[PDB]
Amino acid sequence: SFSGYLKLTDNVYIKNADIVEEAKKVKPTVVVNAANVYLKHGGGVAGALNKATNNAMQVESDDYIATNGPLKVGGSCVLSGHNLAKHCLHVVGPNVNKGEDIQLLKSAYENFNQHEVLLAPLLSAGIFGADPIHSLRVCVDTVRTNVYLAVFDKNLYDKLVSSFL
Ligand SMILES: CC(C)(O)[C@H]1CCCN1c1ncnc2[nH]ccc12
Ligand SMILES: [Cl-]
């Protein structure tokens, strides 16, 4: 199971790690992808997870969108975890660079509550443009199930821990 995490709260844990390497090591029931509404896994967490599946995640995702249309900002879908996990929960946080409402970040994290245990990144961080410190606060104040956060930036990880209030 999960190793080397700092406990932030009763249910939130955090580690300086690449979510792809964590997933390959642990093979959790659920890995969260930081998706966009089109499930176009081009870069960041999504591009890295998809690359590790040899593009099978993208092929599955394109079939999903062709059938169902895009997700909502704040929404999610459950797809296969391929070689990385049983399932992948694709969750769309708001992209501040697109003018999307940061309040939708709480809605995005609510999707985690449908799953008992998840390996996840901080939503809306990275190329989605939001402050990771704010994202962690929303996570802790929204998710009630057990979440293991992989932060792939050592300086950021240290700042998140040292400023956690
Ligand atoms: C740095 C931060 C917040 O953790 C997010 C935003 C940018 C990329 N990132 C990642 N997180 C975890 N595992 C990852 N693997 C590849 C990328 C990646
Ligand atoms: Cl990202």
GROMACS .gro file of N, CA and C and ligand atoms in nm:
model
  514
    1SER      N    1   0.083  -0.120   0.000
    1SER     CA    2   0.000   0.000   0.000
    1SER      C    3   0.087   0.126   0.000
    2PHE      N    4   0.029   0.238   0.042
    2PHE     CA    5   0.095   0.368   0.030
    2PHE      C    6   0.203   0.382   0.137
    3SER      N    7   0.317   0.441   0.099
    3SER     CA    8   0.433   0.452   0.186
    3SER      C    9   0.492   0.592   0.177
    4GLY      N   10   0.543   0.642   0.289
    4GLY     CA   11   0.616   0.767   0.288
    4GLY      C   12   0.534   0.894   0.286
    5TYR      N   13   0.405   0.887   0.317
    5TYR     CA   14   0.320   1.005   0.316
    5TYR      C   15   0.321   1.075   0.451
    6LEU      N   16   0.315   1.208   0.446
    6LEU     CA   17   0.283   1.290   0.563
    6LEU      C   18   0.131   1.296   0.578
    7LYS      N   19   0.084   1.281   0.702
    7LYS     CA   20  -0.058   1.290   0.733
    7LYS      C   21  -0.091   1.437   0.759
    8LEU      N   22  -0.183   1.493   0.680
    8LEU     CA   23  -0.226   1.630   0.707
    8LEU      C   24  -0.348   1.636   0.798
    9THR      N   25  -0.443   1.545   0.778
    9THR     CA   26  -0.568   1.541   0.853
    9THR      C   27  -0.607   1.396   0.873
   10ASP      N   28  -0.726   1.374   0.928
   10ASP     CA   29  -0.774   1.238   0.947
   10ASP      C   30  -0.778   1.160   0.816
   11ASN      N   31  -0.797   1.228   0.702
   11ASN     CA   32  -0.818   1.159   0.576
   11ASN      C   33  -0.731   1.204   0.460
   12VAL      N   34  -0.648   1.307   0.476
   12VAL     CA   35  -0.565   1.361   0.368
   12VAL      C   36  -0.418   1.338   0.400
   13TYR      N   37  -0.347   1.281   0.303
   13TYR     CA   38  -0.206   1.248   0.310
   13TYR      C   39  -0.134   1.312   0.191
   14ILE      N   40  -0.004   1.338   0.205
   14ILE     CA   41   0.069   1.411   0.101
   14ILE      C   42   0.213   1.361   0.093
   15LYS      N   43   0.267   1.358  -0.029
   15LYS     CA   44   0.402   1.308  -0.055
   15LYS      C   45   0.460   1.381  -0.175
   16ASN      N   46   0.591   1.406  -0.172
   16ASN     CA   47   0.662   1.455  -0.291
   16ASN      C   48   0.687   1.335  -0.381
   17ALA      N   49   0.610   1.325  -0.490
   17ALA     CA   50   0.619   1.209  -0.578
   17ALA      C   51   0.555   1.242  -0.712
   18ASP      N   52   0.598   1.168  -0.813
   18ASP     CA   53   0.533   1.163  -0.944
   18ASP      C   54   0.416   1.065  -0.935
   19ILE      N   55   0.295   1.114  -0.962
   19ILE     CA   56   0.176   1.030  -0.953
   19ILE      C   57   0.188   0.907  -1.042
   20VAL      N   58   0.260   0.919  -1.154
   20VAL     CA   59   0.275   0.804  -1.244
   20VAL      C   60   0.358   0.696  -1.177
   21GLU      N   61   0.466   0.734  -1.110
   21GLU     CA   62   0.548   0.636  -1.041
   21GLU      C   63   0.476   0.578  -0.920
   22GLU      N   64   0.403   0.662  -0.846
   22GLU     CA   65   0.321   0.611  -0.736
   22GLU      C   66   0.223   0.508  -0.788
   23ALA      N   67   0.153   0.540  -0.898
   23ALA     CA   68   0.054   0.447  -0.951
   23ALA      C   69   0.118   0.316  -0.994
   24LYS      N   70   0.232   0.323  -1.063
   24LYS     CA   71   0.298   0.201  -1.106
   24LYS      C   72   0.343   0.117  -0.987
   25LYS      N   73   0.383   0.181  -0.878
   25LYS     CA   74   0.428   0.108  -0.760
   25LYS      C   75   0.311   0.047  -0.682
   26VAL      N   76   0.205   0.125  -0.661
   26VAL     CA   77   0.096   0.084  -0.573
   26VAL      C   78  -0.017   0.013  -0.648
   27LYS      N   79  -0.042   0.053  -0.773
   27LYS     CA   80  -0.156   0.005  -0.851
   27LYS      C   81  -0.285   0.019  -0.770
   28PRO      N   82  -0.321   0.142  -0.732
   28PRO     CA   83  -0.437   0.164  -0.646
   28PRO      C   84  -0.568   0.133  -0.717
   29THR      N   85  -0.674   0.125  -0.636
   29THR     CA   86  -0.807   0.108  -0.692
   29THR      C   87  -0.846   0.226  -0.781
   30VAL      N   88  -0.814   0.348  -0.739
   30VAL     CA   89  -0.848   0.469  -0.814
   30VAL      C   90  -0.728   0.562  -0.819
   31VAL      N   91  -0.687   0.599  -0.940
   31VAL     CA   92  -0.598   0.712  -0.963
   31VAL      C   93  -0.680   0.824  -1.026
   32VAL      N   94  -0.659   0.946  -0.977
   32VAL     CA   95  -0.726   1.064  -1.031
   32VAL      C   96  -0.639   1.126  -1.139
   33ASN      N   97  -0.701   1.154  -1.253
   33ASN     CA   98  -0.640   1.234  -1.358
   33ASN      C   99  -0.692   1.378  -1.350
   34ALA      N  100  -0.599   1.472  -1.367
   34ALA     CA  101  -0.631   1.614  -1.381
   34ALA      C  102  -0.668   1.641  -1.527
   35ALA      N  103  -0.794   1.614  -1.560
   35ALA     CA  104  -0.842   1.615  -1.697
   35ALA      C  105  -0.894   1.752  -1.738
   36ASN      N  106  -0.906   1.771  -1.870
   36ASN     CA  107  -0.990   1.876  -1.926
   36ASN      C  108  -1.122   1.815  -1.976
   37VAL      N  109  -1.216   1.903  -2.012
   37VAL     CA  110  -1.351   1.857  -2.045
   37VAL      C  111  -1.354   1.767  -2.168
   38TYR      N  112  -1.251   1.775  -2.253
   38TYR     CA  113  -1.243   1.696  -2.375
   38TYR      C  114  -1.168   1.565  -2.355
   39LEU      N  115  -1.117   1.540  -2.235
   39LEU     CA  116  -1.030   1.426  -2.209
   39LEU      C  117  -0.917   1.418  -2.310
   40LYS      N  118  -0.860   1.533  -2.345
   40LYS     CA  119  -0.743   1.540  -2.432
   40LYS      C  120  -0.621   1.548  -2.341
   41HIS      N  121  -0.549   1.437  -2.331
   41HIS     CA  122  -0.445   1.421  -2.229
   41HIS      C  123  -0.310   1.461  -2.286
   42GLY      N  124  -0.291   1.592  -2.300
   42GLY     CA  125  -0.176   1.642  -2.374
   42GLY      C  126  -0.051   1.665  -2.291
   43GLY      N  127  -0.067   1.707  -2.166
   43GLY     CA  128   0.048   1.746  -2.086
   43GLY      C  129   0.016   1.738  -1.938
   44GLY      N  130   0.114   1.775  -1.857
   44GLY     CA  131   0.096   1.770  -1.713
   44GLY      C  132   0.067   1.629  -1.665
   45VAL      N  133  -0.014   1.621  -1.559
   45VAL     CA  134  -0.055   1.492  -1.505
   45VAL      C  135  -0.117   1.406  -1.615
   46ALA      N  136  -0.210   1.463  -1.691
   46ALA     CA  137  -0.285   1.384  -1.789
   46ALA      C  138  -0.194   1.329  -1.897
   47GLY      N  139  -0.107   1.414  -1.952
   47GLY     CA  140  -0.016   1.368  -2.055
   47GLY      C  141   0.077   1.259  -2.004
   48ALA      N  142   0.122   1.273  -1.878
   48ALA     CA  143   0.212   1.174  -1.819
   48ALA      C  144   0.141   1.042  -1.791
   49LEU      N  145   0.019   1.047  -1.735
   49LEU     CA  146  -0.056   0.925  -1.713
   49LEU      C  147  -0.084   0.856  -1.846
   50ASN      N  148  -0.128   0.933  -1.944
   50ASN     CA  149  -0.161   0.871  -2.072
   50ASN      C  150  -0.039   0.806  -2.136
   51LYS      N  151   0.076   0.875  -2.134
   51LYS     CA  152   0.198   0.818  -2.190
   51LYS      C  153   0.231   0.685  -2.125
   52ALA      N  154   0.212   0.675  -1.993
   52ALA     CA  155   0.243   0.552  -1.922
   52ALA      C  156   0.150   0.438  -1.961
   53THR      N  157   0.031   0.468  -2.015
   53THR     CA  158  -0.060   0.367  -2.068
   53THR      C  159  -0.038   0.338  -2.217
   54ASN      N  160   0.069   0.390  -2.276
   54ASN     CA  161   0.096   0.366  -2.418
   54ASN      C  162  -0.016   0.422  -2.505
   55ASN      N  163  -0.081   0.531  -2.461
   55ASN     CA  164  -0.190   0.599  -2.532
   55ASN      C  165  -0.323   0.524  -2.523
   56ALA      N  166  -0.331   0.414  -2.449
   56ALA     CA  167  -0.459   0.345  -2.436
   56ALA      C  168  -0.562   0.430  -2.362
   57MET      N  169  -0.518   0.509  -2.265
   57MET     CA  170  -0.609   0.601  -2.198
   57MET      C  171  -0.673   0.699  -2.296
   58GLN      N  172  -0.593   0.754  -2.388
   58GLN     CA  173  -0.647   0.847  -2.486
   58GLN      C  174  -0.747   0.780  -2.579
   59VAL      N  175  -0.717   0.658  -2.624
   59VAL     CA  176  -0.808   0.587  -2.714
   59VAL      C  177  -0.942   0.563  -2.645
   60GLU      N  178  -0.938   0.516  -2.520
   60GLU     CA  179  -1.060   0.494  -2.444
   60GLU      C  180  -1.136   0.625  -2.425
   61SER      N  181  -1.061   0.732  -2.394
   61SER     CA  182  -1.121   0.862  -2.369
   61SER      C  183  -1.190   0.917  -2.493
   62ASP      N  184  -1.129   0.901  -2.610
   62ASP     CA  185  -1.190   0.951  -2.733
   62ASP      C  186  -1.322   0.879  -2.761
   63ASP      N  187  -1.327   0.749  -2.735
   63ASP     CA  188  -1.453   0.676  -2.750
   63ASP      C  189  -1.558   0.728  -2.651
   64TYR      N  190  -1.516   0.756  -2.527
   64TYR     CA  191  -1.608   0.810  -2.427
   64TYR      C  192  -1.668   0.942  -2.474
   65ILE      N  193  -1.583   1.034  -2.524
   65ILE     CA  194  -1.632   1.165  -2.566
   65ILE      C  195  -1.720   1.153  -2.690
   66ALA      N  196  -1.683   1.064  -2.783
   66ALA     CA  197  -1.763   1.045  -2.903
   66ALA      C  198  -1.904   0.996  -2.868
   67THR      N  199  -1.919   0.925  -2.757
   67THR     CA  200  -2.046   0.872  -2.712
   67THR      C  201  -2.124   0.972  -2.627
   68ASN      N  202  -2.055   1.044  -2.538
   68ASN     CA  203  -2.119   1.118  -2.430
   68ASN      C  204  -2.103   1.269  -2.438
   69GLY      N  205  -2.015   1.319  -2.522
   69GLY     CA  206  -1.982   1.459  -2.522
   69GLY      C  207  -1.891   1.495  -2.407
   70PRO      N  208  -1.851   1.622  -2.401
   70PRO     CA  209  -1.753   1.665  -2.299
   70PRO      C  210  -1.809   1.656  -2.158
   71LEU      N  211  -1.717   1.649  -2.063
   71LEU     CA  212  -1.752   1.666  -1.924
   71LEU      C  213  -1.789   1.812  -1.898
   72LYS      N  214  -1.842   1.836  -1.779
   72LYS     CA  215  -1.856   1.970  -1.723
   72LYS      C  216  -1.730   2.008  -1.648
   73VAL      N  217  -1.698   2.138  -1.646
   73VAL     CA  218  -1.597   2.186  -1.552
   73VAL      C  219  -1.652   2.164  -1.412
   74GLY      N  220  -1.574   2.096  -1.327
   74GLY     CA  221  -1.620   2.049  -1.197
   74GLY      C  222  -1.668   1.906  -1.196
   75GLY      N  223  -1.683   1.844  -1.314
   75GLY     CA  224  -1.735   1.710  -1.326
   75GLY      C  225  -1.626   1.605  -1.340
   76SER      N  226  -1.671   1.481  -1.360
   76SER     CA  227  -1.580   1.368  -1.365
   76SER      C  228  -1.644   1.251  -1.440
   77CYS      N  229  -1.560   1.155  -1.475
   77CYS     CA  230  -1.607   1.025  -1.520
   77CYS      C  231  -1.509   0.919  -1.474
   78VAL      N  232  -1.560   0.797  -1.456
   78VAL     CA  233  -1.478   0.682  -1.420
   78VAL      C  234  -1.451   0.600  -1.545
   79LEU      N  235  -1.323   0.581  -1.576
   79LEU     CA  236  -1.278   0.498  -1.687
   79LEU      C  237  -1.176   0.398  -1.635
   80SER      N  238  -1.121   0.317  -1.726
   80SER     CA  239  -1.022   0.219  -1.684
   80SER      C  240  -0.895   0.287  -1.632
   81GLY      N  241  -0.829   0.220  -1.538
   81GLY     CA  242  -0.696   0.259  -1.496
   81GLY      C  243  -0.584   0.194  -1.575
   82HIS      N  244  -0.618   0.109  -1.671
   82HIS     CA  245  -0.520   0.045  -1.760
   82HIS      C  246  -0.415  -0.026  -1.675
   83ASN      N  247  -0.286  -0.003  -1.699
   83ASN     CA  248  -0.179  -0.068  -1.626
   83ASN      C  249  -0.143   0.003  -1.497
   84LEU      N  250  -0.211   0.113  -1.464
   84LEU     CA  251  -0.172   0.199  -1.352
   84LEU      C  252  -0.260   0.185  -1.229
   85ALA      N  253  -0.383   0.138  -1.245
   85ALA     CA  254  -0.481   0.135  -1.138
   85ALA      C  255  -0.600   0.054  -1.188
   86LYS      N  256  -0.690   0.016  -1.097
   86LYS     CA  257  -0.812  -0.047  -1.144
   86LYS      C  258  -0.893   0.051  -1.229
   87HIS      N  259  -0.915   0.171  -1.174
   87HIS     CA  260  -0.995   0.274  -1.237
   87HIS      C  261  -0.917   0.405  -1.240
   88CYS      N  262  -0.948   0.488  -1.339
   88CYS     CA  263  -0.905   0.626  -1.341
   88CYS      C  264  -1.027   0.717  -1.330
   89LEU      N  265  -1.028   0.800  -1.227
   89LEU     CA  266  -1.130   0.903  -1.211
   89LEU      C  267  -1.078   1.030  -1.277
   90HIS      N  268  -1.133   1.063  -1.393
   90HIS     CA  269  -1.094   1.184  -1.466
   90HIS      C  270  -1.175   1.300  -1.408
   91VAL      N  271  -1.109   1.397  -1.346
   91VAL     CA  272  -1.176   1.507  -1.279
   91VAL      C  273  -1.131   1.638  -1.342
   92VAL      N  274  -1.227   1.726  -1.374
   92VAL     CA  275  -1.199   1.854  -1.437
   92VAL      C  276  -1.207   1.965  -1.334
   93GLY      N  277  -1.092   2.016  -1.292
   93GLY     CA  278  -1.088   2.138  -1.216
   93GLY      C  279  -1.097   2.257  -1.308
   94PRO      N  280  -1.135   2.373  -1.256
   94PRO     CA  281  -1.137   2.494  -1.338
   94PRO      C  282  -0.997   2.532  -1.384
   95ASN      N  283  -0.989   2.577  -1.508
   95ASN     CA  284  -0.867   2.631  -1.566
   95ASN      C  285  -0.876   2.783  -1.558
   96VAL      N  286  -0.801   2.840  -1.464
   96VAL     CA  287  -0.802   2.985  -1.444
   96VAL      C  288  -0.750   3.058  -1.567
   97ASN      N  289  -0.663   2.995  -1.646
   97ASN     CA  290  -0.614   3.057  -1.768
   97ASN      C  291  -0.723   3.071  -1.874
   98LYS      N  292  -0.834   2.999  -1.859
   98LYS     CA  293  -0.950   3.010  -1.947
   98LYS      C  294  -1.062   3.093  -1.886
   99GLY      N  295  -1.038   3.156  -1.771
   99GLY     CA  296  -1.141   3.233  -1.705
   99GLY      C  297  -1.247   3.152  -1.635
  100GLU      N  298  -1.221   3.024  -1.609
  100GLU     CA  299  -1.320   2.940  -1.543
  100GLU      C  300  -1.324   2.969  -1.393
  101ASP      N  301  -1.444   2.957  -1.336
  101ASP     CA  302  -1.472   3.001  -1.200
  101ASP      C  303  -1.399   2.914  -1.097
  102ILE      N  304  -1.311   2.976  -1.018
  102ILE     CA  305  -1.234   2.902  -0.918
  102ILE      C  306  -1.325   2.833  -0.817
  103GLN      N  307  -1.447   2.883  -0.798
  103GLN     CA  308  -1.542   2.817  -0.709
  103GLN      C  309  -1.574   2.675  -0.753
  104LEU      N  310  -1.557   2.644  -0.882
  104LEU     CA  311  -1.580   2.509  -0.931
  104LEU      C  312  -1.475   2.410  -0.881
  105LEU      N  313  -1.366   2.458  -0.821
  105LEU     CA  314  -1.267   2.366  -0.765
  105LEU      C  315  -1.327   2.283  -0.652
  106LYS      N  316  -1.414   2.342  -0.569
  106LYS     CA  317  -1.478   2.263  -0.465
  106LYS      C  318  -1.566   2.154  -0.527
  107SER      N  319  -1.642   2.188  -0.631
  107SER     CA  320  -1.724   2.089  -0.699
  107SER      C  321  -1.639   1.977  -0.755
  108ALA      N  322  -1.523   2.012  -0.812
  108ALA     CA  323  -1.432   1.911  -0.866
  108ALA      C  324  -1.389   1.813  -0.757
  109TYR      N  325  -1.347   1.865  -0.640
  109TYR     CA  326  -1.304   1.777  -0.532
  109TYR      C  327  -1.418   1.691  -0.477
  110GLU      N  328  -1.544   1.738  -0.486
  110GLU     CA  329  -1.655   1.658  -0.435
  110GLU      C  330  -1.663   1.523  -0.505
  111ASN      N  331  -1.615   1.514  -0.630
  111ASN     CA  332  -1.616   1.386  -0.700
  111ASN      C  333  -1.535   1.281  -0.625
  112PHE      N  334  -1.432   1.323  -0.550
  112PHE     CA  335  -1.350   1.227  -0.478
  112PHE      C  336  -1.431   1.152  -0.372
  113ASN      N  337  -1.538   1.213  -0.320
  113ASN     CA  338  -1.614   1.153  -0.211
  113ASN      C  339  -1.692   1.029  -0.253
  114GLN      N  340  -1.702   1.000  -0.383
  114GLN     CA  341  -1.766   0.879  -0.430
  114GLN      C  342  -1.674   0.758  -0.427
  115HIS      N  343  -1.551   0.772  -0.375
  115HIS     CA  344  -1.450   0.666  -0.376
  115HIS      C  345  -1.383   0.662  -0.240
  116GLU      N  346  -1.371   0.542  -0.184
  116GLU     CA  347  -1.321   0.527  -0.047
  116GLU      C  348  -1.176   0.570  -0.033
  117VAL      N  349  -1.093   0.541  -0.134
  117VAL     CA  350  -0.950   0.569  -0.132
  117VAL      C  351  -0.908   0.610  -0.272
  118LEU      N  352  -0.827   0.716  -0.281
  118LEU     CA  353  -0.778   0.765  -0.409
  118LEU      C  354  -0.633   0.810  -0.399
  119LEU      N  355  -0.559   0.787  -0.507
  119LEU     CA  356  -0.431   0.852  -0.534
  119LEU      C  357  -0.458   0.968  -0.628
  120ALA      N  358  -0.414   1.089  -0.594
  120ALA     CA  359  -0.457   1.206  -0.669
  120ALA      C  360  -0.351   1.315  -0.674
  121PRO      N  361  -0.358   1.403  -0.774
  121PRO     CA  362  -0.284   1.529  -0.772
  121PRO      C  363  -0.373   1.639  -0.714
  122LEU      N  364  -0.310   1.753  -0.683
  122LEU     CA  365  -0.384   1.874  -0.652
  122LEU      C  366  -0.453   1.929  -0.777
  123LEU      N  367  -0.583   1.942  -0.771
  123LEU     CA  368  -0.659   1.988  -0.886
  123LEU      C  369  -0.640   2.137  -0.910
  124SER      N  370  -0.642   2.173  -1.038
  124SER     CA  371  -0.632   2.309  -1.089
  124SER      C  372  -0.493   2.368  -1.071
  125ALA      N  373  -0.397   2.290  -1.022
  125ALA     CA  374  -0.258   2.334  -1.016
  125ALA      C  375  -0.193   2.311  -1.153
  126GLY      N  376  -0.061   2.328  -1.161
  126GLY     CA  377   0.004   2.308  -1.288
  126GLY      C  378  -0.050   2.404  -1.393
  127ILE      N  379  -0.074   2.351  -1.513
  127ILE     CA  380  -0.112   2.436  -1.626
  127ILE      C  381  -0.253   2.491  -1.613
  128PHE      N  382  -0.331   2.445  -1.514
  128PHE     CA  383  -0.463   2.501  -1.492
  128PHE      C  384  -0.457   2.634  -1.417
  129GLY      N  385  -0.341   2.675  -1.367
  129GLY     CA  386  -0.321   2.813  -1.328
  129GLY      C  387  -0.361   2.854  -1.188
  130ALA      N  388  -0.420   2.766  -1.108
  130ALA     CA  389  -0.460   2.805  -0.973
  130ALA      C  390  -0.344   2.788  -0.875
  131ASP      N  391  -0.359   2.853  -0.760
  131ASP     CA  392  -0.258   2.845  -0.655
  131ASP      C  393  -0.266   2.709  -0.587
  132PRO      N  394  -0.159   2.629  -0.589
  132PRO     CA  395  -0.165   2.498  -0.522
  132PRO      C  396  -0.195   2.506  -0.373
  133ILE      N  397  -0.155   2.614  -0.305
  133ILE     CA  398  -0.187   2.628  -0.163
  133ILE      C  399  -0.338   2.636  -0.144
  134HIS      N  400  -0.405   2.714  -0.229
  134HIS     CA  401  -0.551   2.719  -0.224
  134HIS      C  402  -0.612   2.583  -0.257
  135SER      N  403  -0.559   2.515  -0.360
  135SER     CA  404  -0.613   2.385  -0.396
  135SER      C  405  -0.605   2.286  -0.280
  136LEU      N  406  -0.492   2.285  -0.207
  136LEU     CA  407  -0.481   2.195  -0.093
  136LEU      C  408  -0.584   2.229   0.014
  137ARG      N  409  -0.606   2.358   0.039
  137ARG     CA  410  -0.706   2.399   0.138
  137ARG      C  411  -0.844   2.349   0.099
  138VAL      N  412  -0.882   2.368  -0.028
  138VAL     CA  413  -1.012   2.321  -0.073
  138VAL      C  414  -1.021   2.169  -0.061
  139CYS      N  415  -0.913   2.099  -0.096
  139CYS     CA  416  -0.912   1.954  -0.083
  139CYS      C  417  -0.943   1.913   0.061
  140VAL      N  418  -0.867   1.967   0.157
  140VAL     CA  419  -0.883   1.929   0.297
  140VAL      C  420  -1.023   1.961   0.348
  141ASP      N  421  -1.081   2.071   0.301
  141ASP     CA  422  -1.212   2.117   0.347
  141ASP      C  423  -1.328   2.054   0.270
  142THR      N  424  -1.301   1.972   0.169
  142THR     CA  425  -1.405   1.915   0.085
  142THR      C  426  -1.405   1.763   0.084
  143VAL      N  427  -1.288   1.701   0.068
  143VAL     CA  428  -1.280   1.556   0.057
  143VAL      C  429  -1.290   1.495   0.196
  144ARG      N  430  -1.378   1.396   0.210
  144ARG     CA  431  -1.397   1.320   0.333
  144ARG      C  432  -1.344   1.178   0.325
  145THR      N  433  -1.323   1.126   0.204
  145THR     CA  434  -1.266   0.994   0.185
  145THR      C  435  -1.113   1.005   0.191
  146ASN      N  436  -1.044   0.892   0.184
  146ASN     CA  437  -0.900   0.889   0.207
  146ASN      C  438  -0.827   0.921   0.077
  147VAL      N  439  -0.754   1.032   0.078
  147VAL     CA  440  -0.686   1.081  -0.040
  147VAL      C  441  -0.537   1.092  -0.013
  148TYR      N  442  -0.460   1.034  -0.105
  148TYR     CA  443  -0.314   1.034  -0.105
  148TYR      C  444  -0.269   1.124  -0.219
  149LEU      N  445  -0.217   1.242  -0.183
  149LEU     CA  446  -0.179   1.344  -0.279
  149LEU      C  447  -0.031   1.329  -0.315
  150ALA      N  448  -0.005   1.322  -0.445
  150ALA     CA  449   0.131   1.318  -0.500
  150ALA      C  450   0.161   1.454  -0.560
  151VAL      N  451   0.260   1.523  -0.503
  151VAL     CA  452   0.303   1.655  -0.547
  151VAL      C  453   0.440   1.640  -0.612
  152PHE      N  454   0.448   1.666  -0.742
  152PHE     CA  455   0.570   1.642  -0.819
  152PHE      C  456   0.656   1.767  -0.828
  153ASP      N  457   0.686   1.828  -0.715
  153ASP     CA  458   0.762   1.954  -0.712
  153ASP      C  459   0.807   1.965  -0.567
  154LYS      N  460   0.937   1.946  -0.542
  154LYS     CA  461   0.984   1.937  -0.404
  154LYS      C  462   0.969   2.070  -0.332
  155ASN      N  463   1.006   2.181  -0.397
  155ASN     CA  464   0.991   2.311  -0.332
  155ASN      C  465   0.844   2.339  -0.298
  156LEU      N  466   0.753   2.306  -0.390
  156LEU     CA  467   0.611   2.325  -0.364
  156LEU      C  468   0.564   2.237  -0.250
  157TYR      N  469   0.601   2.109  -0.252
  157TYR     CA  470   0.567   2.019  -0.143
  157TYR      C  471   0.609   2.077  -0.008
  158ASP      N  472   0.734   2.124   0.002
  158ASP     CA  473   0.782   2.179   0.128
  158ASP      C  474   0.703   2.303   0.170
  159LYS      N  475   0.666   2.387   0.074
  159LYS     CA  476   0.586   2.506   0.104
  159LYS      C  477   0.446   2.468   0.150
  160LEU      N  478   0.384   2.370   0.083
  160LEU     CA  479   0.251   2.326   0.123
  160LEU      C  480   0.250   2.274   0.267
  161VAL      N  481   0.351   2.195   0.304
  161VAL     CA  482   0.356   2.140   0.439
  161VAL      C  483   0.382   2.251   0.541
  162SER      N  484   0.479   2.337   0.512
  162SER     CA  485   0.524   2.433   0.612
  162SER      C  486   0.424   2.546   0.635
  163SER      N  487   0.330   2.567   0.543
  163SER     CA  488   0.230   2.673   0.556
  163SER      C  489   0.091   2.618   0.584
  164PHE      N  490   0.079   2.488   0.609
  164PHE     CA  491  -0.053   2.428   0.627
  164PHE      C  492  -0.116   2.479   0.756
  165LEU      N  493  -0.228   2.550   0.743
  165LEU     CA  494  -0.296   2.608   0.858
  165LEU      C  495  -0.442   2.564   0.861
  166LIG     C1  496   0.329   1.975  -0.947
  166LIG     C2  497   0.188   1.917  -0.923
  166LIG     C3  498   0.101   2.022  -0.850
  166LIG     O1  499   0.196   1.804  -0.841
  166LIG     C4  500   0.113   1.881  -1.058
  166LIG     C5  501   0.085   2.006  -1.150
  166LIG     C6  502   0.189   2.006  -1.263
  166LIG     C7  503   0.228   1.856  -1.279
  166LIG     N1  504   0.195   1.793  -1.149
  166LIG     C8  505   0.215   1.654  -1.127
  166LIG     N2  506   0.176   1.606  -1.006
  166LIG     C9  507   0.199   1.473  -0.977
  166LIG     N3  508   0.253   1.380  -1.056
  166LIG    C10  509   0.288   1.433  -1.177
  166LIG     N4  510   0.348   1.356  -1.277
  166LIG    C11  511   0.369   1.440  -1.388
  166LIG    C12  512   0.326   1.567  -1.359
  166LIG    C13  513   0.274   1.567  -1.224
  167CL      CL  514  -0.129   1.925  -1.473
   0.00000   0.00000   0.00000
